[PDB]
């Protein structure tokens, strides 16, 4: 139905947890106060890309590394 761009204005910690990686990488937790929650990311979001980096079939660690690059634009899909 839709793909969405969720952009986080980083200060640093994002305030989210991910599961999955090499059947896709998914947001498993969003700290209520954290930057991710404030920016509109939601549990169940599947991360497709990070700042243009395709992470659809990324490793778990690869996804972590992409998220910790030095705004953080996340392309996500919800199933």
């Amino acid at each position: 139905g839709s793909v969405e761009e969720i952009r986080l204005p980083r200060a640093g910690p994002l305030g989210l947890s991910i599961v999955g990686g090499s059947p896709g990488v998914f947001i498993s937790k969003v700290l209520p106060r954290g930057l991710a929650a404030r920016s509109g990311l939601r549990v169940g979001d599947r991360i497709l890309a990070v700042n243009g980096q395709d992470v659809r079939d990324a490793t778990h660690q690869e996804a972590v590394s992409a998220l910790l690059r030095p705004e953080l634009s996340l392309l996500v899909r919800r199933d």
């Binding site: 910690p13 994002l14 305030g15 989210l16 947890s17 991910i18 599961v19 999955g20 498993s28 937790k29 778990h60 972590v64 998220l67 910790l68």
Partner: peptide, 7 residues
Amino acid sequence: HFRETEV
């Protein structure tokens, strides 16, 4: 069971 990483 499913590794979860805080970021």
